[PDB]
Amino acid sequence: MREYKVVVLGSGGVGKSALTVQFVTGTFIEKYDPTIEDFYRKEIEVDSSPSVLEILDTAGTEQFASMRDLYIKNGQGFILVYSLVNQQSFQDIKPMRDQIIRVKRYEKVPVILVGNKVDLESEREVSSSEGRALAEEWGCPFMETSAKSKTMVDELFAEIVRQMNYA
Ligand SMILES: Nc1nc2c(ncn2[C@@H]2O[C@H](COP(=O)(O)OP(=O)(O)OP(=O)(O)O)[C@@H](O)[C@H]2O)c(=O)[nH]1
Ligand SMILES: [Mg+2]
């Protein structure tokens, strides 16, 4: 069976686990449980191709950045998450693409930039077009999601598998 290794990266609270847990189970996690490291496996049909996604839900907690170089080496596609209601989390995501490329040593790593928490449109600190621009300087897809939408999360993970197939 083909198998894809995806690392979900970002700062604390942005919604990494709520996005991953919505893909894997169809449920929205409301109670913030800070994450050390968690692996999930889910059989995916993208373009009608049956594969496995193995998903690495990292910690955005400052200490575990020691591990990040191992995660980047052991991983094929990367979902880079910011919360659009927190512009510091948008700022924390910009060095991370280039950190991905120092370890991988080539330019075209399959990445997607995600502005999560779009359902909280009142609280928005980061505009669509700031993210949209970052994604195009980075040459990657851009999505704004709400971990509350099964449909929005599903498209995110299906597009990471499409990205790992035209890499
Ligand atoms: N409104 C809204 N809340 C969200 C969304 N995604 C996550 N949350 C909430 O944000 C909080 C943090 O979400 P998590 O996904 O647990 O955070 P994380 O980014 O995995 O955090 P770390 O594990 O510390 O890296 C929780 O209370 C979630 O319920 C979203 O799309 N919309
Ligand atoms: Mg988490």
String of b and e for 124-148 (b: at least 16 CB within 10 Å)?
bebeeeebeebbeebebbbbbbbbb
> Rounded to whole angstroms, how far apart are CA atoms 27 and 9?
20
Contact in structure between 54 and 23 (CB atoms under 8 Å): no
The phi and psi torsions of 7 (rounded to 5 degrees) equal -105, 130
Contact in structure between 78 and 157 (CB atoms under 8 Å): no
Which bound ligand lies closest to the C-alpha atom of 15? 1
Which bound ligand lies closest to the C-alpha atom of 64? 1
The phi and psi torsions of 3 (rounded to 5 degrees) equal -150, 135
Which atom from ligand 1 is nearest to the alpha carbon of 60?
Answer: 25
Annotated binding residues for GTP, written as ranges, equal 10-17, 57-61, 116-119
Identify the bridge partners of residue 116 per DSSP, sorted by sequence position.
Answer: 83, 145
String of b and e for 37-46 (b: at least 16 CB within 10 Å)?
ebebeeebeb
Q: Fill in the amino acid letter for 38.
A: D
Contact in structure between 156 and 118 (CB atoms under 8 Å): no
Give the binding-site residues of ligand 1, using a 6 Å CB cut-off. 10, 12-18, 29-30, 32, 34-35, 59-61, 116-117, 119-120, 146-148
Contact in structure between 13 and 83 (CB atoms under 8 Å): yes
The phi and psi torsions of 110 (rounded to 5 degrees) equal -65, 105
Structure determined by: X-ray
Exposed (0-12), middle (13-18) or buried (19+): which is 47, by Cβ within 10 Å? Answer: exposed
Domains of the chain: 1-167 (3.40.50.300)
Of 16, 71, 51, nearest to 163 by C-alpha is 51
Neighbours of ion ligand 2 (CB under 5 A): 17, 35
Q: After which residues is the chain broken (C to N over 2.5 A)?
A: none
Contact in structure between 67 and 89 (CB atoms under 8 Å): no
> Rounded to whole angstroms, how far apart are CA atoms 32 and 46?
30
